[PDB]
Design a binder for this molecule. Structure first.
Ligand SMILES: COc1ccc(-n2c(=O)n(Cc3cc4cc(Cl)ccc4n3CCCC#N)c3cnccc32)cc1OC
Ligand SMILES: [Cl-]
Ligand SMILES: [Cl-]
Ligand SMILES: [Cl-]
Ligand SMILES: [Cl-]
Ligand SMILES: [Cl-]
Ligand SMILES: [Cl-]
Lengths: 432, 432, 432
């Protein structure tokens, strides 16, 4: 059940009904490929064997160094593959690769305890040693062997291609790195809750986009790369999306108008007694009513930040805004409708596909729901609205920009707030 | 005929002679692939059949949810695939896929009227049902069949790969989604003007970059994805590119200087009596003298915005600037030359490849055309200039930063304008 | 030897010990592919020949036009492929392609002098003319020829695929454009120093990411694309990375606090008597202790900018800061530790994997090294620290935010500095 409320007073709208899936941690698995030491049909086999050798050499040469890779400016700075790189660094210690090679001798999956105590799931996805030693060495022939060897070697060649243009670190994790069944069985044998396994298994395409593949080591006929998978430690909490657009006065004299915009737009999810706030567009991914975000791109805020939607002048949280005199027209397409900021001479309308223009917006900030509306036009820009089913509520209220004296209004404030704007107005009213 | 003018007074330059091709709308087509229900040569065929089945399963599991995906901060916010997703949602209604399956029984292209009245062009690009049922079922053999089945199945495997790492939505649209001849014949059978067909057909690589492929439904042996193609409703209007760079005073005492920069840089195209303004770099693509832009990334401005180039103090449009005291050196490579903002101790030169340094810039903002100039250097940064043919005109004029008293100059104004700067100066001159 | 210093007084940290590799120029090579003019086994060959012809046609149609493609806002604007496009433009002049075709008749590599004097290295990587004329024309059969022709043609098909979704300009340069051995031998036959050859050869994956492939011309059975490779004219100079985080007062009354942040974070490298400053995250790539940057994304600053780390009030360089009252909590993961900006009610801790929480941060800006620390948590965000070996030094000092009177503190200054903040404070203290 997705619902939406538009606040006429602040030119903003909140879409709720979403459920969280936040990446809070990382799981590191070690994916291995076992390697071999080494007429027209034999010629094709030798050409494919050369492609095999060059791929090994290319990956060997690849890792002569350590692997590396409105309110967004308030975010901190993480190191996204620090956990995977740390595991990879452990794999270079003496005897470490040999432990993995021994654990996977009689099975393709095994949990191995690394020397520093880290327990990682290991996975041998391709045994090229067995194939080359048992099927190709006796030759050095028929066409079926040529075809089969090309099929088996192709995956190594494609993994190498990906690492070669990504400096050894890829994201999203492709099906060459981990096929769909491999990833599913990895998730299944992963030490996580039943809710997490079901969530990851039903959203593998999102899991791939939030994962990293880190080329790690070639040693003792073992090719190992670390696949860093997301841990969703927050699931099924309420989330809501805040959409904001400029609210300006609408006086006829050009340049005499003042504007404010709520700057706190983005995704919000309840999380551990606080609210995780994701300011940056497209750092969250919506699947139906589930929203996948990454806490690395969030601020942790008091839950009172939500009061800004119902009462922007509330005394418990100082709601953030920016101010200007740039009254240009635009639209913000919401989850269930469209906010329209129409100023000046701009033509602003809403239309249905079958009937055409059904509403002409007057100057100011207004809203239409997606029920019976297919597009909105603001100036020369046509916007298609989202056709998701859900109820919108229009909350009438006097635009708060009307409460300000333009003669003392502080414009060109970007990182401002209700209180900071009051503070500056008081200082200007004092000097006069 | 590309031409350029440099305005010494405002440290800016305008390149004109370009012709518009603006994406104003979207066309949605439905691309279908028909699917089949299901010794060494048979073993290779069974391995390829398993890859076929796993791809179907992977795509089935992929769509258990709804598909989703200086002055730029003034732009609105659209929902780029809202139109395609709406069409995809219609394809899930009962009987809808069956209509497409029936329309394409005896032909690979057909226009189908969907239940909600939407008329979409449909296209069956691959009949794997016919191939597997008529060529592979009788077996369950020779090597040529193995090769042929791998060739036909590969496209399904690659489409699936693309969707798997893009969560079901890809852009640009690859030749696996729509081959070049397929796209060309799609454009040809598209209900659009002759000018649009010629424009799209001669610029298919740009059409691909402005299109989306949306994985939609697998149902009744039909795989359908929606290809959302750009509609160019504005073509062949004049466009011009505005380049700007900081203009600072050049006093010797460090820190005593003041700067302004025109913030209205970007692409401008005449459009329907107004001007479409594209502030963000690389949201427009230039092909010779044709500039492809997307109106979703534009403001719609009065045509008087153009007056800022010839007279930044004009009374009809309030030209936008930012102010600072950060007099750092840089260059802006224009269409036909280079703007050089040289301040402090920076070494700023222009060179020809055969002769070396031909000009040393003094402190201030200056310009050289690309005629006889191959590179400019500002500090430790070497810039190659564009070698496009065209005439430059140097418009001499006193740098407007000289008209300001630094003691009342308001610096650190980002979203400012000529008038707002005058307004603040008047208030500062009043208190004194 | 990577080392790090944390400055408690300014909530910042400098990581040093790195060595530079800066792209300062471009080298343009011309890569060519020689082309041919043109039962179940012959049917597969004819299908592959059609894919060959369509690829040629697609590339012909592709180039009917000219090829094109905190403090970051201070950077200039370059034209990254201006040098390659200029070389490509020369290849269209009459007789130019014929010179390359003649130079490569008896050898696959040759230096050619173009008509405008430009000396380019040329490279024929694939002779499809010889293969089709000598192996396929006599037929118009066996399965080995079908397999071999698919192998040879595949590279042309993949190059075309890359150009088709990139509008003729790709970066990174893939192994289809230039295989690893091809690139290595290109570097080896390149007219550059021994240090550059060793540097490029040991970091080919970075070379690929800093290179462009520009589809140029199909003419006289020759397919030519220009590969624009980086020239590293600055190597082995000291580089250091500056990390910064907000420094706020910690009074209990919400909203009464003031903040400043050093805005000069990014990479710094000594360069030709000045310092190249790279403000933008991830425009530099670190390989062990070598940092690859691009001077196009740099400012050239006086070396005195370094004084801001030891003495932010130094009289020789005016250190840049931003000011606000937005005291939100976050962390910055450094090279060898973590800066923690903890304000309000936020829970801020540091943990070891084996023992859990070992330190709880109090309000203010603080730091922990990565020795014995695996993660830090600030609010709902868990950060893994980098586990690189190296020594950290904690430089104690009074937070400089304590020196400011909040009643006259100018907040919401983004492009500010120590002196500009003093200037504004003096004007506010004068009116009172
Ligand atoms: C990507 O889209 C965006 C574009 C701009 C903003 N944005 C800011 O960051 N600031 C703060 C600020 C004030 C200031 C003063 C001067 Cl003298 C110079 C640089 C200044 N900066 C940073 C500018 C960075 C760039 N370019 C803004 C202040 N007013 C309006 C918009 C602002 C936000 C965006 O995210 C939606
Ligand atoms: Cl979203
Ligand atoms: Cl929707
Ligand atoms: Cl451009
Ligand atoms: Cl050019
Ligand atoms: Cl870095
Ligand atoms: Cl590290």
């Amino acid at each position: 059940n997705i619902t939406e409320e538009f606040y006429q007073s602040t030119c903003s709208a909140v879409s709720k009904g979403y459920l969280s899936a936040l990446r809070t941690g990382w799981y590191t698995s070690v994916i291995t490929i076992e390697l071999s030491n080494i007429d027209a049909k034999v010629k094709l086999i030798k050409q494919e064997l050369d492609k095999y050798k060059n791929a090994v050499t290319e990956l060997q040469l690849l890792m002569q160094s350590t692997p590396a890779t409105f309110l967004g400016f308030l975010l901190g700075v993480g190191s996204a593959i620090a956990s995977g790189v740390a595991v990879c660094k452990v794999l270079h210690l003496e005897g470490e690769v040999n432990k993995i090679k021994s654990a996977l001798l009689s099975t393709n999956k095994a949990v191995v305890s690394l020397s520093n105590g880290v327990s990682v799931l290991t996975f041998k996805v391709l045994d090229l040693k067995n194939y080359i030693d048992k099927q190709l060495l006796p030759i050095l022939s028929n066409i079926e062997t040529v075809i089969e060897f090309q099929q088996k070697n192709n995956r190594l060649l494609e993994i190498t291609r990906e690492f070669s243009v990504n400096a050894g670190v890829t994201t999203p994790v492709s099906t060459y790195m981990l096929t769909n069944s491999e990833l599913l069985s990895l998730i299944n044998d992963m030490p996580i809750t039943n809710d997490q396994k079901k969530l990851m298994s039903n959203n593998v395409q999102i899991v791939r986009q939030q994962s990293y593949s880190i080329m790690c080591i070639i040693k003792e006929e073992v090719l190992a790369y670390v696949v860093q998978l997301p841990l969703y430690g927050v699931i099924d909490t309420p989330c809501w999306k805040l959409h904001t657009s400029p609210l300006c006065t609408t006086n006829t004299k050009e340049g005499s108008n003042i504007c404010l915009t709520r700057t706190d737009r983005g995704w919000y999810c309840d999380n551990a007694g606080s609210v995780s706030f994701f300011p940056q567009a497209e750092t969250c991914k919506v699947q139906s009513n589930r929203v996948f975000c990454d806490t690395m791109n969030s601020l942790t805020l008091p839950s009172e930040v939500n009061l800004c939607n119902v009462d922007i002048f509330n005394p418990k949280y100082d709601c953030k805004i920016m101010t200007s005199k740039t009254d240009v027209s635009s639209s913000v397409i919401t989850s269930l409708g469209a906010i329209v900021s129409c100023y000046g001479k701009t033509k602003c309308t809403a239309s249905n596909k079958n009937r055409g223009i059904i509403k002409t917006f007057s100057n100011g900030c207004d809203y239409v729901s997606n029920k019976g509306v297919d597009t909105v036009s603001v100036g020369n820009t046509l916007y298609y609205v989202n056709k998701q089913e859900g109820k919108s509520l229009y909350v009438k209220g006097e635009p708060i920009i009307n409460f300000y004296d333009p003669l003392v209004f502080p414009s060109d404030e970007f990182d401002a707030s209700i209180s900071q704007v009051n503070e500056k107005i008081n200082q200007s009213l004092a000097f006069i």
